[PDB]
Design a protein around this ligand. Structure first.
Ligand code: MG
Ligand code: MG
Ligand code: MG
Ligand code: MG
Ligand code: MG
Ligand code: MG
Ligand code: MG
Ligand code: MG
Ligand code: MG
Ligand code: MG
Ligand code: MG
Ligand code: MG
Ligand code: MG
Ligand code: MG
Ligand code: MG
Ligand code: MG
Ligand code: MG
Ligand code: ZN
Ligand code: ZN
Lengths: 175, 141, 129, 82, 149
RNA sequence: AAACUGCAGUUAAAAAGCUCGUAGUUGGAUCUUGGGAGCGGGCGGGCGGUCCAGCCACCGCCCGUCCCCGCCCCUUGCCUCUCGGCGCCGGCCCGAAGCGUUUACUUUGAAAAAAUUAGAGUGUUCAAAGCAGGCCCCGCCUGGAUACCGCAGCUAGGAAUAAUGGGGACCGCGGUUCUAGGAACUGAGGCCAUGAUUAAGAGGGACGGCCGGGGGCAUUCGUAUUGCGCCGCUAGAGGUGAAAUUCUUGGACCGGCGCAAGACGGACCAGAGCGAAAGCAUUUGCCAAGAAUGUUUUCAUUAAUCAAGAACGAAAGUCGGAGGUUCGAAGACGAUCAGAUACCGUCGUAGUUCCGACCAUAAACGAUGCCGACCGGCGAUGCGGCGGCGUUAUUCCCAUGACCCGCCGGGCAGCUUCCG
């Protein structure tokens, strides 16, 4: 369809000594013990990407239940305004994903950005706070997150959820 | 499409049998066609006679050429080329000696290793080469 | 030839749903079809409908609300025990907050949640969400 | 497309559609009273007759079957019934 | 569509919604029955009898007037056909084609049509045996078919 | 099994020439959810009576009950089995004491070795293990456990779903009483018939008028080509890039007239029509078949897809007969320029034609299984039907048409498109 054609078109276009010395050097976060995140706690806040929701529907996986199976802990999925906007732009064909996203257990958090691009918004939140887990199946987004220290990545492998850089994985699939 | 009837178990069972035989891994495993495919004839190691040392006879001081030897397998009489692990283990090995040979190079070939050689020498006179090199054992005659 | 009148009724409602129709005509009618449509209407998925009485198997005109995502039939009608009910929910229903599985049990035709309350199993008819 | 009410078709819409495709089926044929010429006896004749209809009084040919409708002889008069 | 022919058509009869006898019909149930008995003795099939009553006597449906079907009325009086009407006509057609085919060996088309007719005979005969209209030994034979009808 | 469901089949590996058709698989809608008649009691509304105005007094009518609650009654039948008959000629009739659906499914209950596994208790100094209750100068602390256990066979609760089941608007005979020919009782025979509803925008059959290069047999016409006979005239004709083999003064070629043989069916001829496909074109006659349309005719599920099996299958080719104009693989002759410019000419074997037997293959194409349902507009086109302001012909027979406009079906094809 031309929805497919417009999508591939969009993705193609996507790619003196007296003066005081001043410089912005952000401080290393105190939460991290080298590469280990100590303040990441058993209540996990997980930032869900838009394509993560759709592939969970294809794999017949409930969102909250499958995350609990992976971690054996209480998990709080989080939805940004950027991600919610992209689901709405998909249309009536993706109405099932839209209903799932508006779930009272989910955490609805605001964002005041310029633009709707949700990969940029999710990277910015990761840089600021270091308390989230990122759940996505997008490959280039996962490459960007891997450059940021102390942030685990949740993804779908076979018909189960999997986690990437988390020491307290416990009930996670083996290879 | 395939039949999706309630009383179709026999039809479904025949389809799955045919699909199994099209798997080349399934046919090879059940017919035993490739049990003796490897150069060792199904074994993990082999015994051979040291013929002569190609690397030493040539005068190139490469140290990658120098540790190549020719041996003849006792089981089937084939002639192969193997690596000696280190220069100076050649001194422990003489011609017409009996050695144990294992495979080498499934993972790959390192920098400074000659491609196309897929064997290495592990023991001589049933003594490991590292033990002889470290001075923990002596070669019986 | 036509072998499942319930399958044809659900497909035509599904296709009229996609195309933005306000009314759909389904024929032939059946009491299984009427009972299935009643279950969907109690949960707010279709709305009121009319049964036209010709002297040969009937017709139904259904009003549409635009709230239906997917309605379908399960063929053949598998026997479902109470222990198997949870497995069928996960395979057919995307969410645990909406959508229903329609069963024909010895106590009648009901949704799968009502069947669990009455402690009865039966045969699966279809689903809608 | 045009918006039509499936539950309430207009009279012009139903008389135009095929007889099997209406909401409730109805034939397009009818019965008529024909008055014979020469003797004025009345005979009931089907509109789409497939046989030659003779007047009972005098055995005069009243109609001859065709593909769609029976053609009536010259000089007879007819009325629709019911 | 057709069981053998590729074409699919929609030409058929459409019965009215109303099942009541019209007021202008002056014949009684008993009067219609004696007409059926008279025409059957003349050698007319039940399909042809219903056609005659519709065209001339204004009887749109015998079933609505008398409460019984034409074949059921004839069976009760004792005028039952030896063979079912649809089966009887199919056997008659096969005899005519076979008689034509014995004088024309080169008519490949007639040979092909004969196979199709015999297939419908086998399907129809199998159904009638299950309903016990025919004995469970009745068989259709080319030489026997001429004596059958 | 490391990284209830395999992924695909126009152009990328692939759906096989066509139809019929067996086993297997799958099958439209509805019913089997009884009928009656009178008396009561509650409930509401009004009237009256008796007592001497009545919560502190008893009686009696009437109307109604969204509609409750009692009380009684019909539910037909059948002869497969069994038990019977004081009944008639082995057969038949009768009462029954006989029979008057079954199963799948689902939810229970019994009966079903331990060990292992899950799980409860317990400081082996911890742990891997092991074990299978303790207290008192009856009684307390607790419960040293418990759960699972495919299918099939037993058991009993259940409304759905799906299998299964589901008389003559006739004839001759007798017997008993009561009456002046009548009536009322009653008794056995013979034929035919024995069935849930409807009538599917499921299927079959019949009927009506049409329609088509659909098929088979016979018949017939048309030029052309070839051969032959005769007549006129006189040197060439043929063929090629150029020529040459070949034919010609005993007349070639060309012109005229006539005769014979074998093939072929131009123009009209359309992206029109017909057939399962391969395929199908002169007139007329005959034989059988068919699509669609029309139908207030008939049957009543008779259906779909299909390994096995069967019929057909361009061209070429094989076997046996009959013919042989044209064309023509092969072969023999004559030549062989241009040139990446590249296969000619004369004669012409088998064949090409017909009648029988084989052979079963094609880019045998939409490089694209079948059946059913659903899912946009706009005009033309072929056939059938319906309605119509007007033009145009007319009906001994033969025939009732030609054009224009609106509508309805099934076809052959197009122009445009939303979502997918
Ligand atoms: Mg994105
Ligand atoms: Mg028809
Ligand atoms: Mg059914
Ligand atoms: Mg039970
Ligand atoms: Mg019908
Ligand atoms: Mg014709
Ligand atoms: Mg024709
Ligand atoms: Mg001459
Ligand atoms: Mg001449
Ligand atoms: Mg011609
Ligand atoms: Mg041929
Ligand atoms: Mg030939
Ligand atoms: Mg020959
Ligand atoms: Mg072709
Ligand atoms: Mg093909
Ligand atoms: Mg046509
Ligand atoms: Mg027309
Ligand atoms: Zn944002
Ligand atoms: Zn008359």
């Amino acid at each position: 369809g031309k929805q497919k054609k417009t999508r591939k078109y969009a993705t193609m276009k996507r790619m003196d000594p007296s003066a005081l010395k001043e410089r912005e050097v952000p401080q290393h976060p105190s939460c991290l013990f080298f590469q280990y995140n100590t303040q990441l706690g058993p209540p996990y806040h997980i930032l869900v990407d838009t394509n993560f929701i759709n592939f969970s529907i294809k794999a017949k996986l409930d969102l909250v239940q499958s995350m609990m199976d992976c971690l054996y802990a209480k998990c709080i999925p989080c939805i940004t305004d950027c991600v919610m906007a992209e689901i709405e732009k998909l249309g009536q064909k993706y109405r099932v994903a839209l209903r799932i996203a508006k779930d009272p257990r989910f955490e609805r958090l605001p964002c005041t950005h310029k633009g709707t691009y949700a990969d940029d918004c999710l990277v910015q939140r990761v840089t600021q706070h270091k308390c989230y887990i990122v759940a996505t199946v997008d490959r280039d987004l996962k490459r960007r997150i891997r450059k940021i220290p102390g942030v685990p990545i949740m993804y779908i492998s076979n018909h189960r959820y999997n986690i990437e850089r988390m020491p307290d994985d416990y009930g996670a699939p083996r290879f | 499409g395939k039949c999706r009837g309630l009383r179709t178990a026999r039809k479904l069972r025949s389809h799955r049998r045919d699909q199994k035989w099209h798997d080349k891994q399934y046919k090879k495993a059940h017919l035993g066609t490739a049990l003796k495919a490897n150069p060792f004839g199904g074994a993990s190691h082999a015994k051979g006679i040291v013929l002569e040392k190609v690397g030493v006879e040539a005068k190139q001081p490469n140290s990658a050429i120098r540790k190549c030897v020719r041996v003849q397998l006792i089981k089937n009489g084939k002639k192969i080329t193997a690596f000696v692990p280190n220069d100076g283990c050649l001194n422990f090995i003489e011609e017409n000696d009996e050695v144990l040979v294992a495979g080498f190079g499934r993972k790959g070939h390192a920098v400074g290793d000659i491609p196309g050689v897929r064997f290495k020498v592990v023991k001589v006179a049933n003594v490991s080469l590292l033990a002889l090199y470290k001075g923990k054992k002596e070669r019986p005659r | 030839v036509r072998m499942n009148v319930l399958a044809d009724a659900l497909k035509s409602i599904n296709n009229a749903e996609k195309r933005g129709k306000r009314q759909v005509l389904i024929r032939p009618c059946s009491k299984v079809i009427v009972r299935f449509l009643t279950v969907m209407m109690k949960h707010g998925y279709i709305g009121e409908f009319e049964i036209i009485d010709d002297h040969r198997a009937g017709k139904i005109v259904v009003n549409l609300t635009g709230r239906l995502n997917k309605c379908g039939v399960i063929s053949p009608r598998f026997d479902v025990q109470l222990k198997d009910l949870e497995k069928w929910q996960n395979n057919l229903l995307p969410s645990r907050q909406f959508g229903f599985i329609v069963l024909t049990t010895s106590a009648g035709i009901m949704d799968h949640e009502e069947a669990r309350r009455k402690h009865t199993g039966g045969k699966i008819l279809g689903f809608f969400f | 497309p045009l918006a039509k009410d499936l539950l309430h078709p207009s009279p012009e819409e139903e008389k135009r559609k095929h007889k099997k495709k209406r909401l409730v089926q109805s034939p397009n044929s009818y019965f008529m009273d024909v008055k014979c010429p020469g003797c004025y006896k009345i005979t009931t004749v089907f509109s789409h007759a497939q046989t030659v209809v003779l007047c009972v009084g005098c055995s005069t040919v009243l109609c001859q079957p065709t593909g769609g409708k029976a053609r009536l002889t010259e000089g007879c008069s007819f009325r629709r019934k019911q | 569509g057709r069981m053998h022919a590729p074409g699919k058509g929609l030409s058929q009869s459409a019965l009215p919604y109303r099942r009541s006898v019209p007021t202008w019909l002056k014949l009684t149930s008993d009067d219609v029955k004696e007409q059926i008995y008279k025409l059957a003795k003349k050698g007319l099939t039940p399909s042809q009898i219903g056609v005659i009553l519709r065209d001339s006597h204004g009887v749109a449906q015998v079933r609505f007037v008398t409460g019984n079907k034409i074949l059921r009325i004839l069976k009760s009086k004792g005028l039952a056909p030896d063979l079912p009407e649809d089966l009887y006509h199919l056997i008659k057609k096969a005899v005519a084609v076979r008689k034509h085919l014995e004088r024309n060996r080169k008519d490949k088309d007639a040979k092909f049509r004969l196979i199709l007719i015999e297939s419908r005979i086998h399907r129809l005969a199998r159904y009638y045996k299950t309903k016990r209209v025919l004995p469970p030994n009745w068989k259709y034979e080319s030489s026997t078919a001429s004596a059958l009808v």
